Structure 1
C-alpha cells in the first residue's frame, strides 16, 4: 500500500505511522499496571467488568460473516468498550489527529477512532485497549511534553508552550521535573490524582521533534512546498466535483 503522496519528511512520517510493517520507535518503558492507572477505567487487580456475557455463552444463529470474522479477545470475553484520548501540540508533536485515526484503522482491529482539532480518541474492548494503549504511550506516537493523555478538558493543541516546552493542560496531568529533565504523569487521563506518579521519560529535543513530526508548518516543512501532496488533494477536489455533476 502507498498510504499518502508527497516528498517531505512529514509525508514519509505519515506513511510510516499508517504502515503496519513499519516498526514504531520505542522511546520509553511503562509497566502494565501504570498503563491501567493512566487509563483510569479499573483499579490494578480488579476483574474486567462485562457489558454482556462471553460469546461462547450466547446462542447465536448461523451467520457466514460472524463465522469468517475472528472476534478480538475482549469481544470473546464480553468486556466494556472504553477509550484512550490524546491531544497533540501544533508545535511539532510527532503524531497529529488525522494521522492517528488513519494509522489506527490500518494497524488495529475492531477500532472506533474519532478525530477533532484538540483531541483524538480510540474506543475498543477493554483488555485489547490496554494492549494498544501501551504501544500508543511507549512509542513515537507520544512525546510527554508536546502530547497529552486527556479524557476531558483538552484545551492546548493551539496554545503557546510554557517555559519548560510543555503544552498547556488546564488540569496539569503531566508535570515536567526540572531536576531530572523527565515528565511525570501525576493524574490519570480524566484528572484524578494517582497514588504514585508514572515516569514518561524526557521530552524529545527540537531536532528530533523536527525529524519525526507529521504537521506541515512554514517554520518546518510547508505543505504548499510538498507540491505532489497538494496535487493529489486538488485532484480529489476536481474529481469529486465532476462526479457529483455528471
Structure 2
C-alpha cells in the first residue's frame, strides 16, 4: 500500500505511521505498571472488570471467520487512551493517529478531533497498544499529552520549558534533570509515584519526525503532489454526486 502521496518529510512520516511494516522508533522504556497507572482504568494488580461474560460462556459465518481480540474473549470493558498533539511539530497528529491506528491495530475505535484523539478497545488489548503509543515516536513528553479531559493546549503557545499547556498539569518538566515526569493519570488523578517519560525531543528531531505541515517547517502548499490528490478527490466527489 502507498497510504499517502507527497514528497516531503511530512508525507513520508505519515506513510511511516500507517505502514505496519515500518517499525516505530522506540524512544523510551515504560513498565507495565506505569502504563496501567497512566491509563487510570484499574489499579495495577486489580482484576479486569467485565461488561459481559466470556464468549465461551450464535451460528454466524462472520463470527467464525473473525478472530476476536483477547479482551473481547474475556469480556473486558471498553476503555480508552486519548492524546493531545501540539501544532508546534509534535511527531503524531490527530488524523495521522486514527489513520495509523486502523492500519496497525485490530478491533480499534478511533476518533479524531482538533484538540484530542481517542482510541477505545478492550481493556487488556488497550494496555498492549498504549505501551507502543507511549514508548515509540508516536509520543513526545513535551509536545504531546495523555489527556482524558480538559485537553486544551494543541493550539496554544508553549511555556518557558517548551511544554504544551495543560490545565491540569499532568506532565511536569524537571528543570534540574531535563526530563518530564507524569504526576497524574490521563483523567487528572494524582499518582502515588510519578512516571518518568524521558527527555523532550530537541527541535531538530521534532521537525524530522513531525506529520504537520507548517510554513516554518514544510508547507503543505509546497508538497504539490499531495495537494493535487486532495484536489482530485474534491473534483471526483463533485462529479460523482452530480451524475
Q: Same fold (TM over 0.5)?
A: yes
TM-score normalised by structure 1 residue count: 0.99
- What does the per-residue CA deviation read over 1:144-198, in whole Å, with 9 as the maximum and x for residues that have no partner? 0000000000000000000100000000000000111000000000000000000
- What does the per-residue CA deviation read over 1:46-89, in whole Å, with 9 as the maximum and x for residues that have no partner? 000000000000xxx21000000000000000000000000000
CA–CA separation in structure 2 for the residues paired with 1:124 and 1:221: 34
- What does the per-residue CA deviation read over 1:10-57, in whole Å, with 9 as the maximum and x for residues that have no partner? 000000000000000000000000000000000011000000000000
CA–CA separation in structure 2 for the residues paired with 1:65 and 1:152: 36
- What does the per-residue CA deviation read over 1:106-138, in whole Å, with 9 as the maximum and x for residues that have no partner? 000000000000000000000000000000000
* Aligned: 1:245 with 2:215: no
* Runs of at least 4 residues off by over 6 Å: none
CA–CA separation in structure 2 for the residues paired with 1:93 and 1:25: 15
CA–CA separation in structure 1 for the residues paired with 2:107 and 2:51: 16
Helix, strand or coil at the partner of 1:56: coil
CA RMSD of aligned residues (A): 0.3
1:62 to 54, 59, 62: 59
- What does the per-residue CA deviation read over 1:211-243, in whole Å, with 9 as the maximum and x for residues that have no partner? 000000000000000000000000000000000
CA–CA separation in structure 2 for the residues paired with 1:167 and 1:26: 22
1:146 to 143, 147, 151: 143
Instruction: Please state how far the C-alpha of 1:141 moved relative to its aligned partner.
Output: 0.2
CA–CA separation in structure 1 for the residues paired with 2:60 and 2:206: 49
* Aligned: 1:205 with 2:202: yes
CA–CA separation in structure 2 for the residues paired with 1:74 and 1:206: 39
CA–CA separation in structure 1 for the residues paired with 2:41 and 2:242: 49
Helix, strand or coil at the partner of 2:45: coil
Mark the runs of 5 or more structure 2 residues left unpaired by the alignment.
Answer: none
CA–CA separation in structure 1 for the residues paired with 2:167 and 2:237: 41
CA–CA separation in structure 2 for the residues paired with 1:198 and 1:143: 14
